[PDB]
């Protein structure tokens, strides 16, 4: 199995100062193979942290990132899946399903990862898989402050992805599972 950590919208240090303590206890070196980050680390502190978790770290540019070197979008292959990554402030109106399906078509990907809304989603539409990891710190968004901290871990093998969703809710880590098969 190839394990991929998917996360972003940390907004450290301006909106939040760290990941939840219970998330940090679970996220330990030596397990994760790739990190796909939707952006808004905003600073090198968090980039450095991700590199402790895995060597292969991919970030795309958020609207509040200090680092302008990050690409606006990326397409990568893991296992048999072509995966697209974008922060998603380019989606107007924010989180619009039609807009996401349009990005999927434009990128020609099996899995589209996007952020910006700070709300977790993992669902299959028209036989393509769409993931939004939410905000790993529970940072406030442009509309709301009751944000649940979350991140996703995709376990890829061949034609199958098992997506595990981690949420900090009721002071505890809650885990949920969803499965997607490439057609």
């Amino acid at each position: 199995h190839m394990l991929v950590l998917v996360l972003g919208d940390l907004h450290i240090p301006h909106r939040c100062n760290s990941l939840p303590a219970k998330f940090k206890k679970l996220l330990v070196p030596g397990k994760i193979q790739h990190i796909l980050c939707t952006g808004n680390l905003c600073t090198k502190e968090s980039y450095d942290y991700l590199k402790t978790l895995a060597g292969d770290v991919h970030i795309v540019r958020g609207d509040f990132d200090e680092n302008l070197n990050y690409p606006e979008q990326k397409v990568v292959t893991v296992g048999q899946f072509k995966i697209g990554l974008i922060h998603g402030h380019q989606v107007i109106p924010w989180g619009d399903m039609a807009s996401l399906a349009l990005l999927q078509r434009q990128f020609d990907v099996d899995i589209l990862i996007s952020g910006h809304t700070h709300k977790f989603e993992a669902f299959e539409h028209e036989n393509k898989f769409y993931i939004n990891p939410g905000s790993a710190t529970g940072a406030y968004n442009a509309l709301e402050t009751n944000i649940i901290p979350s991140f996703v871990l995709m376990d890829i093998q061949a034609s199958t992805v098992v997506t595990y969703v981690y949420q900090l809710i009721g002071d505890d880590v809650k885990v949920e599972r969803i499965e997607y098969k490439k057609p």
Binding site: H1, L26, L27, L153, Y164, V175, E176, R177, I178
Partner: peptide
Amino acid sequence: AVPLEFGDYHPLKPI
């Protein structure tokens, strides 16, 4: 997505 029970595997489950 389906919530996991105590016995279920997930990749960050301590071991």
